[PDB]
Amino acid sequence: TSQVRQNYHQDSEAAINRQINLDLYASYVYLSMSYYFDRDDVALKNFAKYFLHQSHEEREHAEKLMKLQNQRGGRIFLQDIQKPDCDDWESGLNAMECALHLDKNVNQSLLELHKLATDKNDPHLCDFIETHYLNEQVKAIKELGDHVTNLRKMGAPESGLAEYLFDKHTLG
Amino acid sequence: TSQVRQNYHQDSEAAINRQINLDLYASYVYLSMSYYFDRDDVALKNFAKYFLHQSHEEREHAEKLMKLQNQRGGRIFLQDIQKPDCDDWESGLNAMECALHLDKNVNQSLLELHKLATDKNDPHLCDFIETHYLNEQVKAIKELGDHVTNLRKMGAPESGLAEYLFDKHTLG
Amino acid sequence: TSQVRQNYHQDSEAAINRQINLDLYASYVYLSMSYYFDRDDVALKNFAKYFLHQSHEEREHAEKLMKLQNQRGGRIFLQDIQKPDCDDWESGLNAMECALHLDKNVNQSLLELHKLATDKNDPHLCDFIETHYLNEQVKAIKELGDHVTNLRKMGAPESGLAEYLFDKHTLG
Amino acid sequence: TSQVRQNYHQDSEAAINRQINLDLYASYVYLSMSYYFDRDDVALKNFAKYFLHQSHEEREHAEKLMKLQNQRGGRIFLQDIQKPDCDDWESGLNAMECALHLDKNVNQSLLELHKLATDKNDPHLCDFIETHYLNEQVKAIKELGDHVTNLRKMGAPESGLAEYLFDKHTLG
Amino acid sequence: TSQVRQNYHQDSEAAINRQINLDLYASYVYLSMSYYFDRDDVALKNFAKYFLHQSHEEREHAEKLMKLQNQRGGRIFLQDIQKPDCDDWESGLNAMECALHLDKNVNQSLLELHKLATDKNDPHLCDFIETHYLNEQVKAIKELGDHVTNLRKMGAPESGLAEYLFDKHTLG
Amino acid sequence: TSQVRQNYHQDSEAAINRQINLDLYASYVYLSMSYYFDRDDVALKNFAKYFLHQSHEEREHAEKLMKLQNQRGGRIFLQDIQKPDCDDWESGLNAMECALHLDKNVNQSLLELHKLATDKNDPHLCDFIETHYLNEQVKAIKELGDHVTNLRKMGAPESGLAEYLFDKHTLG
Ligand SMILES: [Ca+2]
Ligand SMILES: [Ca+2]
Ligand SMILES: [Ca+2]
Ligand SMILES: [Ca+2]
Ligand SMILES: [Ca+2]
Ligand SMILES: [Ca+2]
Ligand SMILES: [Ca+2]
Ligand SMILES: [Ca+2]
Ligand SMILES: [Ca+2]
Ligand SMILES: [Ca+2]
Ligand SMILES: [Ca+2]
Ligand SMILES: [Ca+2]
Ligand SMILES: [Ca+2]
Ligand SMILES: [Ca+2]
């Protein structure tokens, strides 16, 4: 038992390790998406930039959890970071839809983590999740929803013009 | 009778109170429109910004009338601010058409108020209305007309691309 | 169901709509109070300024809730904004006492909203209310209490001198 | 009953008074430690500076609680501030170990206070404790743990060289 | 016997420890007074600020004595800091009268300490007391006398207006 | 076949994909090491900082290869990023020794990649590897060798003092 450990349940420690992996996985998905848009036969530089930014953001979230783990006297246990489900992401719209799905899954995990912290009467962990993650996640989801709506209304994915103009005017 | 009151007819005092309510109502309509465009399934941020600006402008007009009421020794009597006729505003074009209709109704009220002030030989009130409101209203109406014309010519509301591009290039 | 919606109960959505209306109502009360102090037979410019500031603050609170509603995939439904209970607010002390009563009623609503969010296991909504509203409300109430105490100790409302000096030295 | 009081349980009011005393006590412990390191036969100026900083921090925490008490309409009741358990703190390592023990006891009190606020459905008080104290306390504990680890690994307390070098390189 | 100790009598060492406690006690009294004026039913912010400043000043005096103790090779022995005699300080005038009484008691202790240092032929200690404390104390007493006089002449404590105006114009 | 593809062998494309994975793996190893040194029972902040820097560097190398893949008309295929071989890295020296081993393995892969590019007469790929990676890798290896030597000479890992001082004076 760590000399710093206090009011930190074994289950919370484990759930934090799972959340670290999930955040790294989400970083990897966004990395994959980014470089798809960098392909010469896709060539949407601002979609590429957008998802690369998301990738780095997820990695930062992971690192903050690793810091939290140590702050509470828990022990970090890393797992394989799974390759994303797709190598080819189809279109800007499809990638945005996939990102929305991903962010809602990450949000579900955050909510379960918060439920667990609540059940274990760990107000420090509840506060940590609220402070750093819950509103961040709601904002991300809202933004992805907004992007999906605009792309659909513009005529994506069939309109390559729509995805081109969205790349310039929203993502650029 | 207020110690400051002079040449200020009871009817004018009452019409000013009605105009205060109408301006607050118009503020509320524009507030409603603004946040419609903030919905994730509408997502036109510059339409949202445009109508929020209009909302605050109408509130300022109301406050200036409340100040006028007191300046002349009249007494402010507030009424309920009615909820707008619509919760869902359909499209950017439809909202602009609705705003045009609203601004012309407010203009009609201003003109009737000016007629009343003229009939009561209240040149201070005539001047107040001319100075702060009549040209402001003509400019607003002209701008809304311009916006409606462009949206129609671009292919709104059926073209989601048209409303997207107008949001970026005119309202942004 | 909104593409962004997640862990957001129907009851919470409805309570948010009620809170939007209550905040707009509170904005309206403070607007009414402000311009009472602008009357030539009251003439306390800093009481006027104080309540106008409060009015704009309540409107901002309302707008932030409208933003929250959309962020979570809820749908804004606006209602009439009721006229305040008084047209004449009597004295600076009486208005401050009325403001205290109002702020405690708004606080009660916030607390019920937080209870509802807690009951529906919505930590994002709990956090939103805590972050933006609960401490703001406690500070407001404390300040109004302070003002009431000073006005009473100075001899308000019978001492017009007391209300004059408080206007200058506390509110100015 | 205070005119500002709302949703503030008698038990919470009392627990806040106990927490004020505990924070003042912790301020006193750290004051005692600081000046031990100022002795000519101890002479570790940066250990002295470190604990004096901690002392002032605990006093600030106490004052913020006194402010909270009044904000909520509670009434501050002060108690004797007990002298620390030791006059002589032995060594830098021993003092750090004692500080760790102290901070974990203060943390336990904070957690019990948060449990009480949770049980009394006082989300404002929960938020206050989370905002100002829980993460602050976790950071403090982590830092003290870090210091203890380094001092032990360096060969303290038997190595006067170790405590000298830690004073220079970590605390200086 | 400390390697630095020279011409420092056991009795002086002990009297310095008593003076440290008295200064901490005076810090505590002023802390208590400060937050009384922070209550919503007292609400004199500049009385609050004034006494908080005094509190910090007394703590600084205590710390300087702790430094002196070590400088001379004496050993600091801390005692409980007694809670102040009052929880409720009644009025601004009453608190000022209480502060005057306190400062004169502290002054009496300083004078006895100086007598002791004189009797033990300790010119360094005599000089320390003269330099840091005797004139400081005379100035404090004079200022408190001045404040009491003005408050009485203005009609305090019965005039809440008097205490309000003194808070603004002397303490603000 | 990509419209940009020219003189880019299938085998090279595949080896680039393997190198991307290896770089991501090396990023993960260094991430793991970094946060080990962040543990409260290890507490070497500059070892932590050093390895975190290395982690980000490896990720950048990976991203540059992903860019290269697309530049040449190859197709990125991502694989699982394997968890590092250790969860606990023992000591600063042991981690440095492990980093040296890792960097030499990465170097071996780079050299094989360069051999492959040479065998396939791909001077652009040879130049890319030389420009961005070969000298970078030699410098990294040299630095890690230097660090290992100093740690050993200082008496690590048995001397916790040695690792403490190296953390301060070399890594800080
Ligand atoms: Ca994101
Ligand atoms: Ca796999
Ligand atoms: Ca307008
Ligand atoms: Ca109605
Ligand atoms: Ca307010
Ligand atoms: Ca009504
Ligand atoms: Ca501390
Ligand atoms: Ca005792
Ligand atoms: Ca919270
Ligand atoms: Ca003083
Ligand atoms: Ca006692
Ligand atoms: Ca490197
Ligand atoms: Ca594996
Ligand atoms: Ca070359």
UniProtKB/Swiss-Prot annotation, chains A, B, C, D, E, F:
Signal peptide: none
Function per UniProt: Stores iron in a soluble, non-toxic, readily available form. Important for iron homeostasis. Has ferroxidase activity. Iron is taken up in the ferrous form and deposited as ferric hydroxides after oxidation. Also plays a role in delivery of iron to cells. Mediates iron uptake in capsule cells of the developing kidney. Delivery to lysosomes is mediated by the cargo receptor NCOA4 for autophagic degradation and release of iron.
GO terms under cellular component: autolysosome; autophagosome; cytoplasm; cytosol; extracellular exosome; extracellular region; ferritin complex; ficolin-1-rich granule lumen
Organism: Homo sapiens
Binding residues for Fe cation 2: E58, D103, Q137
Compartments reported by the entry: Cytoplasm; Lysosome; Cytoplasmic vesicle, Autophagosome
Key words, A-Z: Acetylation, Cytoplasm, Cytoplasmic vesicle, Iron, Iron storage, Lysosome, Metal-binding, Neurodegeneration, Oxidoreductase, Phosphoprotein
EC number: 1.16.3.1
Family statement: Belongs to the ferritin family.
GO biological process: immune response; intracellular iron ion homeostasis; iron ion transport; negative regulation of cell population proliferation; negative regulation of ferroptosis; negative regulation of fibroblast proliferation
Site description Essential for association with cargo receptor NCOA4, residues in chain: R18
Enzyme class at the top of the EC tree: oxidoreductase
SUBUNIT field: Oligomer of 24 subunits. There are two types of subunits: L (light) chain and H (heavy) chain. The major chain can be light or heavy, depending on the species and tissue type. In the human liver, the heavy chain is predominant. The functional molecule forms a roughly spherical shell with a diameter of 12 nm and contains a central cavity into which the insoluble mineral iron core is deposited. Interacts with NCOA4; NCOA4 promotes targeting of the iron-binding ferritin complex to autolysosomes following starvation or iron depletion.
UniProt binding sites for Fe cation 1: D23, E58, H61
Tissue: Expressed in the liver.
Gene3D superfamilies for the chain: 1.20.1260.10
Name of the gene: FTH1
Limits of the Ferritin-like diiron domain: 6-155
Protein name, entry field: Ferritin heavy chain
Main location as per UniProt: cytoplasm
Superkingdom classification of source: Eukaryota
UniProt effect for mutating R18A: Abrogates interaction with NCOA4. Fails to localize to punctate lysosomal structures
PANTHER family: FERRITIN (PTHR11431), FERRITIN HEAVY CHAIN (PTHR11431:SF37)
InterPro entries: Ferritin, Ferritin-like, Ferritin-like_diiron, Ferritin-like_SF, Ferritin_CS, Ferritin_DPS_dom
Reactions the enzyme catalyzes: 4 Fe(2+) + O2 + 4 H(+) = 4 Fe(3+) + 2 H2O
Disease: Hemochromatosis 5: A disorder of iron metabolism characterized by iron overload. Excess iron is deposited in a variety of organs leading to their failure, and resulting in serious illnesses including cirrhosis, hepatomas, diabetes, cardiomyopathy, arthritis, and hypogonadotropic hypogonadism. Severe effects of the disease usually do not appear until after decades of progressive iron loading. Neurodegeneration with brain iron accumulation 9: An autosomal dominant neurodegenerative disorder associated with iron accumulation, primarily in the basal ganglia. It is characterized by global developmental delay apparent from infancy, and progressive decline of motor and cognitive skills. Clinical features include delayed walking or inability to walk, spasticity with hyperreflexia, ataxia, dystonia, and poor or absent language.
